[PDB]
Design an enzyme around this catalytic site. Structure first.
Site, PDB file in Angstrom:
ATOM      1  N   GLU B  31       0.921  -1.076   0.086  1.00 21.13           N
ATOM      2  CA  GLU B  31      -0.043   0.039  -0.144  1.00 21.13           C
ATOM      3  C   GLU B  31       0.976   1.218   0.067  1.00 21.13           C
ATOM      4  OE1 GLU B  31      -2.880  -0.097   3.087  1.00 21.13           O
ATOM      5  OE2 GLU B  31      -3.606  -2.218   2.754  1.00 21.13           O
ATOM      6  N   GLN B  50      -4.664  15.792  -6.210  1.00 24.31           N
ATOM      7  CA  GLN B  50      -3.645  15.855  -7.427  1.00 24.31           C
ATOM      8  C   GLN B  50      -2.730  14.830  -7.080  1.00 24.31           C
ATOM      9  OE1 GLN B  50      -1.565  18.931 -10.370  1.00 24.31           O
ATOM     10  NE2 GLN B  50      -3.180  19.428  -9.434  1.00 24.31           N
ATOM     11  N   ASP B  51      -2.330  14.199  -8.338  1.00 25.39           N
ATOM     12  CA  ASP B  51      -1.021  13.197  -8.386  1.00 25.39           C
ATOM     13  C   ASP B  51      -0.312  13.574  -9.511  1.00 25.39           C
ATOM     14  OD1 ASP B  51      -2.384  11.743  -5.985  1.00 25.39           O
ATOM     15  OD2 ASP B  51      -2.934  10.303  -7.431  1.00 25.39           O
ATOM     16  N   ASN B  52       1.166  13.808  -9.088  1.00 27.73           N
ATOM     17  CA  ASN B  52       1.927  14.185 -10.457  1.00 27.73           C
ATOM     18  C   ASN B  52       2.934  13.104 -10.493  1.00 27.73           C
ATOM     19  OD1 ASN B  52       0.596  16.694 -10.503  1.00 27.73           O
ATOM     20  ND2 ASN B  52       1.798  17.706  -9.027  1.00 27.73           N
ATOM     21  N   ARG B  62      14.909  19.732  -9.392  1.00 30.50           N
ATOM     22  CA  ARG B  62      13.774  20.409  -9.566  1.00 30.50           C
ATOM     23  C   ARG B  62      13.517  20.896  -8.292  1.00 30.50           C
ATOM     24  NH1 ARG B  62      10.057  17.848 -14.031  1.00 30.50           N
ATOM     25  NH2 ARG B  62      11.436  16.275 -14.835  1.00 30.50           N
ATOM     26  N   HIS B  65      10.520  24.636  -4.830  1.00 27.37           N
ATOM     27  CA  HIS B  65       8.869  25.125  -4.983  1.00 27.37           C
ATOM     28  C   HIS B  65       7.930  25.325  -4.031  1.00 27.37           C
ATOM     29  CE1 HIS B  65      10.048  23.437  -9.376  1.00 27.37           C
ATOM     30  NE2 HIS B  65      10.543  24.583  -9.089  1.00 27.37           N
ATOM     31  N   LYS B  74       2.452  17.912   0.315  1.00 26.88           N
ATOM     32  CA  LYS B  74       3.005  17.085  -0.601  1.00 26.88           C
ATOM     33  C   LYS B  74       3.611  15.844   0.101  1.00 26.88           C
ATOM     34  CE  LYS B  74       4.550  20.809  -3.403  1.00 26.88           C
ATOM     35  NZ  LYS B  74       5.607  21.581  -3.955  1.00 26.88           N
ATOM     36  N   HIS B 121       9.945  22.644  -1.548  1.00 27.02           N
ATOM     37  CA  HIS B 121      10.428  21.400  -1.780  1.00 27.02           C
ATOM     38  C   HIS B 121      11.374  21.247  -2.934  1.00 27.02           C
ATOM     39  CE1 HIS B 121       9.484  17.352  -3.976  1.00 27.02           C
ATOM     40  NE2 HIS B 121      10.057  17.023  -3.110  1.00 27.02           N
ATOM     41  N   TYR B 134       4.314  12.319  -6.669  1.00 26.96           N
ATOM     42  CA  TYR B 134       3.653  13.091  -5.701  1.00 26.96           C
ATOM     43  C   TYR B 134       2.064  13.287  -5.603  1.00 26.96           C
ATOM     44  CZ  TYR B 134       4.777  17.512  -7.772  1.00 26.96           C
ATOM     45  OH  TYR B 134       5.038  18.761  -8.300  1.00 26.96           O
ATOM     46  N   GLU B 145       2.773  30.219  -8.072  1.00 27.69           N
ATOM     47  CA  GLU B 145       4.115  29.498  -7.696  1.00 27.69           C
ATOM     48  C   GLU B 145       5.202  30.221  -7.578  1.00 27.69           C
ATOM     49  OE1 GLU B 145       4.290  27.200 -11.410  1.00 27.69           O
ATOM     50  OE2 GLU B 145       4.144  25.373 -10.176  1.00 27.69           O
ATOM     51  N   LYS B 170      12.898  28.307 -15.601  1.00 30.76           N
ATOM     52  CA  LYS B 170      12.329  28.871 -14.206  1.00 30.76           C
ATOM     53  C   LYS B 170      13.104  28.705 -13.001  1.00 30.76           C
ATOM     54  CE  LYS B 170       7.969  26.757 -14.070  1.00 30.76           C
ATOM     55  NZ  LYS B 170       8.079  26.174 -12.793  1.00 30.76           N
ATOM     56  N   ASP B 171      13.843  27.403 -12.666  1.00 31.25           N
ATOM     57  CA  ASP B 171      14.637  27.160 -11.377  1.00 31.25           C
ATOM     58  C   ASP B 171      15.601  27.890 -11.440  1.00 31.25           C
ATOM     59  OD1 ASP B 171      12.235  25.654 -10.846  1.00 31.25           O
ATOM     60  OD2 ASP B 171      13.039  23.775 -10.954  1.00 31.25           O
TER      61      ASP B 171
HETATM   62  C1  LIG Z   1      -5.151  -6.103  -1.919  1.00 29.60           C
HETATM   63  C2  LIG Z   1      -4.332  -5.780  -0.689  1.00 29.60           C
HETATM   64  C3  LIG Z   1      -3.530  -6.721  -0.130  1.00 29.60           C
HETATM   65  N1  LIG Z   1      -2.480  -6.432   0.793  1.00 29.60           N
HETATM   66  C4  LIG Z   1      -1.694  -7.573   1.358  1.00 29.60           C
HETATM   67  C5  LIG Z   1      -2.233  -9.030   1.609  1.00 29.60           C
HETATM   68  C6  LIG Z   1      -1.344 -10.012   1.234  1.00 29.60           C
HETATM   69  O1  LIG Z   1      -0.018 -10.098   2.215  1.00 29.60           O
HETATM   70  C7  LIG Z   1      -0.282  -9.176   0.135  1.00 29.60           C
HETATM   71  C8  LIG Z   1      -0.922  -9.746  -1.416  1.00 29.60           C
HETATM   72  O2  LIG Z   1      -2.237  -9.723  -1.343  1.00 29.60           O
HETATM   73  P1  LIG Z   1      -3.185 -10.167  -2.576  1.00 29.60           P
HETATM   74  O3  LIG Z   1      -2.625 -11.480  -3.127  1.00 29.60           O
HETATM   75  O4  LIG Z   1      -4.710 -10.400  -2.202  1.00 29.60           O
HETATM   76  O5  LIG Z   1      -2.849  -8.985  -3.574  1.00 29.60           O
HETATM   77  P2  LIG Z   1      -3.318  -8.995  -5.270  1.00 29.60           P
HETATM   78  O6  LIG Z   1      -3.506 -10.310  -6.047  1.00 29.60           O
HETATM   79  O7  LIG Z   1      -2.096  -8.101  -6.094  1.00 29.60           O
HETATM   80  O8  LIG Z   1      -4.530  -8.152  -5.353  1.00 29.60           O
HETATM   81  C9  LIG Z   1      -5.217  -7.051  -6.241  1.00 29.60           C
HETATM   82  O9  LIG Z   1      -5.130  -7.604  -7.447  1.00 29.60           O
HETATM   83  C10 LIG Z   1      -5.763  -6.455  -8.259  1.00 29.60           C
HETATM   84  C11 LIG Z   1      -6.069  -6.934  -9.660  1.00 29.60           C
HETATM   85  C12 LIG Z   1      -6.810  -5.877  -7.886  1.00 29.60           C
HETATM   86  O10 LIG Z   1      -8.006  -5.516  -8.541  1.00 29.60           O
HETATM   87  C13 LIG Z   1      -6.882  -5.423  -6.293  1.00 29.60           C
HETATM   88  O11 LIG Z   1      -8.132  -4.768  -5.551  1.00 29.60           O
HETATM   89  C14 LIG Z   1      -6.432  -6.630  -5.511  1.00 29.60           C
HETATM   90  O12 LIG Z   1      -7.289  -7.789  -5.712  1.00 29.60           O
HETATM   91  O13 LIG Z   1      -0.738  -7.813   0.365  1.00 29.60           O
HETATM   92  C15 LIG Z   1      -2.654  -5.362   1.641  1.00 29.60           C
HETATM   93  O14 LIG Z   1      -1.932  -5.219   2.532  1.00 29.60           O
HETATM   94  N2  LIG Z   1      -3.566  -4.482   1.262  1.00 29.60           N
HETATM   95  C16 LIG Z   1      -4.317  -4.361   0.122  1.00 29.60           C
HETATM   96  O15 LIG Z   1      -5.089  -3.646  -0.071  1.00 29.60           O
HETATM   97  C1  LIG Z   2       3.572  21.418 -11.201  1.00 33.55           C
HETATM   98  C2  LIG Z   2       2.537  21.302 -12.484  1.00 33.55           C
HETATM   99  C3  LIG Z   2       3.083  21.564 -13.714  1.00 33.55           C
HETATM  100  N1  LIG Z   2       2.422  21.379 -14.850  1.00 33.55           N
HETATM  101  C4  LIG Z   2       2.907  21.545 -16.196  1.00 33.55           C
HETATM  102  C5  LIG Z   2       3.560  22.776 -16.453  1.00 33.55           C
HETATM  103  C6  LIG Z   2       4.450  22.638 -17.338  1.00 33.55           C
HETATM  104  O1  LIG Z   2       4.274  22.495 -18.642  1.00 33.55           O
HETATM  105  C7  LIG Z   2       5.031  21.302 -17.154  1.00 33.55           C
HETATM  106  C8  LIG Z   2       6.599  21.341 -15.990  1.00 33.55           C
HETATM  107  O2  LIG Z   2       6.184  22.152 -15.088  1.00 33.55           O
HETATM  108  P1  LIG Z   2       7.170  22.648 -13.992  1.00 33.55           P
HETATM  109  O3  LIG Z   2       8.587  23.186 -14.664  1.00 33.55           O
HETATM  110  O4  LIG Z   2       6.866  24.027 -12.912  1.00 33.55           O
HETATM  111  O5  LIG Z   2       7.531  21.142 -13.259  1.00 33.55           O
HETATM  112  P2  LIG Z   2       8.415  20.861 -12.061  1.00 33.55           P
HETATM  113  O6  LIG Z   2       9.642  21.686 -12.224  1.00 33.55           O
HETATM  114  O7  LIG Z   2       8.631  19.218 -12.263  1.00 33.55           O
HETATM  115  O8  LIG Z   2       7.595  21.106 -10.621  1.00 33.55           O
HETATM  116  C9  LIG Z   2       7.527  20.425  -9.581  1.00 33.55           C
HETATM  117  O9  LIG Z   2       8.770  20.531  -8.801  1.00 33.55           O
HETATM  118  C10 LIG Z   2       8.676  19.512  -7.555  1.00 33.55           C
HETATM  119  C11 LIG Z   2      10.073  19.673  -6.835  1.00 33.55           C
HETATM  120  C12 LIG Z   2       7.450  20.153  -6.726  1.00 33.55           C
HETATM  121  O10 LIG Z   2       7.363  20.548  -5.710  1.00 33.55           O
HETATM  122  C13 LIG Z   2       6.173  19.949  -7.341  1.00 33.55           C
HETATM  123  O11 LIG Z   2       5.093  20.378  -6.659  1.00 33.55           O
HETATM  124  C14 LIG Z   2       6.522  21.013  -8.705  1.00 33.55           C
HETATM  125  O12 LIG Z   2       6.701  22.237  -8.384  1.00 33.55           O
HETATM  126  O13 LIG Z   2       4.085  20.704 -16.097  1.00 33.55           O
HETATM  127  C15 LIG Z   2       1.028  20.760 -14.561  1.00 33.55           C
HETATM  128  O14 LIG Z   2       0.376  20.719 -15.828  1.00 33.55           O
HETATM  129  N2  LIG Z   2       0.625  20.740 -13.528  1.00 33.55           N
HETATM  130  C16 LIG Z   2       1.339  20.792 -12.347  1.00 33.55           C
HETATM  131  O15 LIG Z   2       0.799  20.492 -11.246  1.00 33.55           O
END
Ligand SMILES: Cc1cn([C@H]2C[C@H](O)[C@@H](COP(=O)(O)OP(=O)(O)O[C@H]3O[C@@H](C)C(=O)[C@@H](O)[C@H]3O)O2)c(=O)[nH]c1=O
Ligand SMILES: Cc1cn([C@H]2C[C@H](O)[C@@H](COP(=O)(O)OP(=O)(O)O[C@H]3O[C@@H](C)C(=O)[C@@H](O)[C@H]3O)O2)c(=O)[nH]c1=O
Lengths: 184, 184
Positions: B31, B50-52, B62, B65, B74, B121, B134, B145, B170-171
């Site tokens: 996990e 958001q995940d980047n 980098r 920021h 983050k 960061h 992140y 920014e 930028k940086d």
């Molecule tokens: C799924 C899961 C497993 N585990 C542990 C239990 C065990 O020790 C080890 C491996 O577990 P499993 O063999 O059930 O993992 P796995 O076969 O990679 O299970 C996953 O497959 C994909 C396709 C999915 O869709 C997920 O929802 C999940 O079912 O990780 C967690 O700690 N948290 C979790 O959320």
């Molecule tokens: C940060 C960010 C950038 N962008 C776009 C703008 C640009 O075209 C491209 C690259 O942007 P940057 O050059 O500002 O990316 P970067 O220099 O990888 O900036 C990152 O650095 C690390 C250390 C952090 O802390 C992050 O939060 C972020 O600031 O991505 C997004 O679409 N979404 C986002 O969230």
């Protein structure tokens, strides 16, 4: 200005996402998830509480998994290698009950699948190794975990395998679709 | 017994996390985030929106920021390679204003750093390539920014880098800490 792409699959509640990637002299950057963009595309709010990461060798198949209570919607992607990812509709009242869709997701294509609660999910590894990441809308509940066996003859999933899959014991012991707990 | 580890760093609001990894003959599962476990360790609720994902060559740096409005907490990790990751406290009223902490995060060690809103960061890439992921508590807001230059002579960050880093434009144009917008 290019942008994220979202495409509903043949089972329309399953959505294929493709991020917009920004390349430069350092490498690349992309948003792998954006709550606003995601919710716009889905048409309803979604909240994730757990992120999971697995690494698997070529021919490993994980699935078909679901939680019958504490059901998990899953947003899945590959950050290393390539997999074929499958979603099976297990909602008894759905017109696509017992149908499935599948797509190749890779580190290179950066495609993601949104698989809502009510579906079973699985993948098979096509590359030497693959790393698979997914976000879930509810927590792991092993008491509620269920599995349908990969090669169920009613589902008839076309896994691109060249050999027998490498399965966990849990997955090898998956139930038949005919015997499986399903959703309303 | 083994489980997720959390350790507060010398600036105690910054937390170093290390997931419990389950290995088997397919590869591994862990996990990478669990909201319950995280909120317990941190002591307060969190919501990520958001995940980047970035990919960077050896010697790429980098940072440093932050967003002065819509400030982002983050949660960061490396999924390929190894980086040295730095958090600088930019809260003027903090007892640790102007201090920084740094840790090596790699795909193999699976360590993560929680960097609260109010910090700058940055990271430098130690491996051939690194992929850095992140999660952020607020959306990208380019209007808000700001950047502090990596080699600011007051911060005196000890970047474990042999040669000059590769920076974005930028940086390269980052402000001196002395001239930077900081948080109250
Ligand atoms: C799924 C899961 C497993 N585990 C542990 C239990 C065990 O020790 C080890 C491996 O577990 P499993 O063999 O059930 O993992 P796995 O076969 O990679 O299970 C996953 O497959 C994909 C396709 C999915 O869709 C997920 O929802 C999940 O079912 O990780 C967690 O700690 N948290 C979790 O959320
Ligand atoms: C940060 C960010 C950038 N962008 C776009 C703008 C640009 O075209 C491209 C690259 O942007 P940057 O050059 O500002 O990316 P970067 O220099 O990888 O900036 C990152 O650095 C690390 C250390 C952090 O802390 C992050 O939060 C972020 O600031 O991505 C997004 O679409 N979404 C986002 O969230």
């Amino acid at each position: 200005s290019m942008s994220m792409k979202a495409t509903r699959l043949a089972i329309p509640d399953v959505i294929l996402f493709e991020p917009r990637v920004f390349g430069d002299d350092r490498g690349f950057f992309f948003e792998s998830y954006n709550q606003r963009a995601f919710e716009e595309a889905c048409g309803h709010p979604v909240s994730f509480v757990q992120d999971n990461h697995s690494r698997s060798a070529r021919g490993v198949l994980r699935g078909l998994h679901y939680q019958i209570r504490q059901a998990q919607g899953k947003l899945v992607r590959a950050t290393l290698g390539e997999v074929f990812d499958v979603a099976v509709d297990l909602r008894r009242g759905s017109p696509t009950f017992g149908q499935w869709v599948g797509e190749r997701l890779s580190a290179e294509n950066k495609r993601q699948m949104w698989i809502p609660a009510g579906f079973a999910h699985g993948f098979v590894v096509l590359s030497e190794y693959a790393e698979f990441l997914y976000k879930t809308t509810d927590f792991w509940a092993p008491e509620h975990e269920r599995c349908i066996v990969w090669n169920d003859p009613e589902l008839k999933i076309d896994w691109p395998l060249q050999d027998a899959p490498l399965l966990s014991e849990k997955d090898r012991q998956g139930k038949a679709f005919a015997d499986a707990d399903c959703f309303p």
